[PDB]
Design a binder for this molecule. Structure first.
Ligand code: CL
Length: 158
């Protein structure tokens, strides 16, 4: 099954943080990276001197069940994030989210797929469109149309 995963980081030097997450994704059991988007840049909100977020989308082929894949993405987030050194929240973070899982709709306390807010996040949609321009959501919406009809912040490549 093809799952689409969002990666985001504003940790340390984000380029290598994201490369580490990618390596970890490829090391998930029964799973293989099919393609990775370009790396995109999201500025922080407000005047503060805060680091930019690096965003990417990954197509991962997997024979894992959705909640099994979630165990792994949560594990990698913990292991690679500075959760132990810093705090769960941030403000500096490594985010790994399952955006889509095949054509499945999952509504559980642990897992909601499609990701609940992805259709409002240009930093998820633009990278996803780069790697899956013909994508159609489970509810029938075409990714290509959402990008024509919703307002998103300008998103430059990293
Ligand atoms: Cl949907």
């Amino acid at each position: 099954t093809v799952a689409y995963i969002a990666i985001g980081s504003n940790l340390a030097s984000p380029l290598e943080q994201v490369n580490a997450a990618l390596k970890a994704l490829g090391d998930i059991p029964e799973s293989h990276i099919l393609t990775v988007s370009s790396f995109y840049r999201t500025p922080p909100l407000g005047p503060q001197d805060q680091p930019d977020y690096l965003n990417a989308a990954v197509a991962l082929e997997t024979s894992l069940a959705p909640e099994e894949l979630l165990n792994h993405t949560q594990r990698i987030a913990l292991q690679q994030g500075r959760v132990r050194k810093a705090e769960r929240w941030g403000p500096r973070t490594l985010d790994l989210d399952i955006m889509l899982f095949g054509n499945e709709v999952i509504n559980t306390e642990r897992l909601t797929v499609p990701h609940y807010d992805m259709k409002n996040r240009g930093f998820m949609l633009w990278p996803l469109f780069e790697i899956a321009p013909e994508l159609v959501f489970p509810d029938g919406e075409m990714l290509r149309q959402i990008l024509h009809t919703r307002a998103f912040d300008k998103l430059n490549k990293w």
